[model samples]
Target: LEEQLNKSLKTIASQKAAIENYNQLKEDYNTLKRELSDRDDEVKRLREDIAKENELRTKAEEEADKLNKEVEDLTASLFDEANNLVADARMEKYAIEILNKRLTEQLREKDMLL
Candidate 1:
């Protein structure tokens, strides 16, 4: 009987943790969604007139390159989801000028969906 109660308690705790994690992810998903929408609005405000985009793009590329080198692959482990998150960030950093709002949000959701 004691063993059974202990098992039941553990199960309950596990479920509670899962629920909390799920709720947090749901919140994050929605927040990221809104930010994605805002990015679209900003692009519209720019009138998509990226005449100076080349200058900004150059700076962006240089900065992204430096950061890429900075992220050393040390003796560590990451969940596949985290690994994908890094990939997502790298893609965004380089392609941010052309990244559409929908794709931005989809990639943003990649980590949260995990």
Candidate 2:
């Protein structure tokens, strides 16, 4: 009877130790699961941020292209205006020369007659 009671007590103690070990493992698993969930959330947030940044960058590039085109058009227009001004100046100079020649001839005729 004594040997049987000792054997029963040893079996109970072994079962209690196993139960404690299983509870510890469950706790560790829960902690690891929570960490994995948090990491997944962080990854999702980072992906969204990257997508928005790319969109803004694309918009900025488009705006820059538009500005470059406007600059080119303005440069061409200014060049055309400058050419027209130069042509007008040359025409005015020739007109002045012709008027001076005609006035000189009139003066010479009047002197000869007097």
Candidate 3:
């Protein structure tokens, strides 16, 4: 009977040890789950930042395109209207000076925006 009690005590000790191992595994599982969730949140936040950056770049590009179109339109007018003038060489020089000044302003402003 005494030997049987020793055997039963040994069985109980190993069972309690198994319980401890199970509890540790559960704690590790929870820790890993939280870590995974935090990583996913980090990914989400980074994606939002990227989207905002892309939107800003696209907006800037559109504004620059608009300025370029204005420059193109005015350049066409400068040549078209000036070519129709009378044969006064002084008139052509004045036209060049005026249009070149305006053209320079637009071009410089475009460079600054970029």
* Model 2 TM-score, all chains together: 0.77
lDDT score, candidate 2 = 0.94
Residue 61's lDDT in candidate 1: 90
Winning candidate number (TM-score): 2
TM-score of each: 0.40, 0.77, 0.62
Q: Estimate the Cα RMSD of every predicted model relative to the unseen true structure.
A: 42.5, 2.4, 19.3
lDDT per residue for candidate 2 within 3-110, as digits (tens), equals: 999989999999999898989999999999999999999999999999999999998999998998899999999998999989898999999989988899989987
Q: Deviation in angstroms for 31 in model 2?
A: 1.8
Q: What local lDDT score does residue 1 receive in model 2, on the 0 to 100 scale? A: 94
Steric clash count of candidate 2: 0
Candidate 3 residue pairs in backbone clash: none
Off-target runs (Cα >4 Å) in candidate 1 are: 48-114
In terms of TM-score, which candidate is stronger, 1 or 2? 2
